Amino acid sequence: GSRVMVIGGDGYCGWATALHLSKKNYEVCIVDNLVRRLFDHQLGLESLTPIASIHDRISRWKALTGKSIELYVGDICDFEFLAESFKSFEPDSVVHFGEQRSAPYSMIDRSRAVYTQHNNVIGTLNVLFAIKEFGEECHLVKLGAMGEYGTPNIDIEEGYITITHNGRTDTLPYPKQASSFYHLSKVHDSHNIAFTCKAWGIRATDLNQGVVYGVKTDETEMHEELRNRLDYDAVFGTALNRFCVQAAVGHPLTVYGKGGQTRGYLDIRDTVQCVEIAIANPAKAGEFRVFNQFTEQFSVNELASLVTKAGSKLGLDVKKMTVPNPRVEAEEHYYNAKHTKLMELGLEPHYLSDSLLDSLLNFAVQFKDRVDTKQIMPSVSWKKIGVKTKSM
């Protein structure tokens, strides 16, 4: 074999997924403009671990396994490029990871908020049109976000909710409440895709994924040049990964506000597994499937405690600090998000364990010398966002 086009395949989730699918014997190609690497240069950021170029990454995989991952370098917002890539590769499935995924980045200034929504929304529209025009039966596996749902006072369902209102019943799309221009762009994406499923017969699966943690997967650990990126800065870094790196360098864990913010989380190893499951068990024509993709819920404070305890076993004497929250969000809220669709399809989760934290912490300690502590504290305010293009 089945042919899979991995848009955003040079990224954190995409690279791990591309290698996994190739190992599982799918014919794979990567479509990426590598703009994520440009963001690092422009903002002065750097991955914890050094990563190889996309060309060397692909070359190494071929040298080790003999398998060739095709590469198409370009911006999917450029339809000519996307169309040519689609016609050249002829994918049976498309996994779309190719979007600006940072909430902080989307809040830097007007230019970055506009770039985020244009890049994400238009890019996704182009993907839908390419599928419709060049391979209508192609299954779209889209990376959405648990953040689309926000933090309502009721249980969060997997994309749909059956409601009885004024004596009548119906199953409707779950109300969306995004808290950043980035999260909003995903809401827009999901609404756009749902429409094309009904109007054109497109088959798609929206993976509303929670926060991913970890850096190792069976494939990326086979050689140093296959190593994945591990972000710890306040722009692209996420909660758990950030805390582990902070613990390793002796920086107090950065708890934003009260720390009651609760979200779904999952090991990067489960990210690749879930995507493969979605590909192996495709949506039917005209069906818009929605899976809540995470394995466990944790509050920020809970993560802080787990990392502190794990760090103690390594003599890190982890400390915690309360950082005035740069974001506008509920710091204490109800949270009970449903997640059984993937489990029903055979998901065998890697729940957060002492072993994972021990491994991740030791990894951070190993490359502690490469950590730029100046990028640990957040400097992007949700409320103070302006129109002048900022230079970090």
Ligand X SMILES: O=c1ccn([C@@H]2O[C@H](COP(=O)(O)OP(=O)(O)O[C@H]3O[C@H](CS(=O)(=O)O)[C@@H](O)[C@H](O)[C@H]3O)[C@@H](O)[C@H]2O)c(=O)[nH]1
**Short-list 372, 377, 216, 193, CA closest to 287:** 193
Contact between 152 and 175 (Cβ < 8 Å): yes
Q: Which is nearer to ligand NAD, 145 or 371 (CB)?
A: 145
Residue 117 found at the interface with a second copy (CB under 8 A): yes
Tally: H helices and E strands in the chain: 12, 14
Nearest approach in angstroms of CB 324 to ligand X is: 11
**Short-list 239, 241, 356, CA closest to 299:** 239
Backbone angles phi, psi at 61, to 5 degrees: -60, -40
A 10 A CB-CB count for 190 gives 24
Quick note: the x/- pattern for ligand X over 249-278, rule CB under 6 A, is -----xxx----x-x---------------
Q: Which does 254 bind (CB under 5 to 8 A by kind): a second copy, ligand NAD, ligand X, none?
A: ligand X
Tell me which of 40, 78, 109, 329 binds ligand X, using CB under 6 A.
Answer: 329
Residue 304 found at the interface with ligand X (CB under 6 A): no
Distance of CA 340 to the CA centre of its chain: 19
Site for ligand NAD in 131-190 (CB under 6 A): 143, 145
Sign of CA dihedral 269, 270, 275, 279: positive
Residue 121 found at the interface with a second copy (CB under 8 A): yes
Sole residue written with tokens 């943690």: 213
Q: Which is nearer to a second copy, 52 or 385 (CB)?
A: 385
Ordered DSSP codes for 36-66: HHHHHHHHT---SS----HHHHHHHHHHHH-
Distance CA 47, CA 367 (A): 10
Q: Which is nearer to ligand NAD, 123 or 316 (CB)?
A: 123
Q: Which is nearer to ligand NAD, 237 or 316 (CB)?
A: 237
Which two three-digit tokens encode residue 68? 């060739």
Q: Which is nearer to ligand NAD, 10 or 276 (CB)?
A: 10
Nearest approach in angstroms of CB 164 to ligand X is: 25
Nearest approach in angstroms of CB 208 to ligand NAD is: 8
Q: Which is nearer to ligand NAD, 59 or 201 (CB)?
A: 59
Distance CA 330, CA 162 (A): 26
Distance CA 274, CA 278 (A): 6
Residue 374 found at the interface with a second copy (CB under 8 A): no
Residues with Cβ within 8 Å of residue 288, at least 6 apart in sequence: 159, 193, 194, 197, 198, 204, 206
A 10 A CB-CB count for 60 gives 17
Site for ligand NAD in 196-215 (CB under 6 A): 209, 211-212
Site for ligand X in 74-113 (CB under 6 A): 101-103
Considering only 40-48, 74-82, 109-117, 248-256, which stretch makes contact with ligand NAD by CB under 6 A? 74-82
Residue 118 found at the interface with a second copy (CB under 8 A): yes
Residue 4 found at the interface with a second copy (CB under 8 A): no
Residue 227 found at the interface with ligand X (CB under 6 A): no
Q: Which does 242 bind (CB under 5 to 8 A by kind): ligand X, ligand NAD, a second copy, none?
A: ligand X
Residue 79 found at the interface with a second copy (CB under 8 A): yes
Residues with Cβ within 8 Å of residue 73, at least 6 apart in sequence: 32, 33, 34, 54
Tell me which of 20, 101, 139, 339 binds ligand NAD, using CB under 6 A.
Answer: 101
Contact between 287 and 35 (Cβ < 8 Å): no
- Kindly list the residues in this chain that would bind ligand NAD in the complex (CB under 6 A): 8, 10-14, 32-36, 75-77, 97-101, 119, 123, 143, 145, 209, 211-212, 238
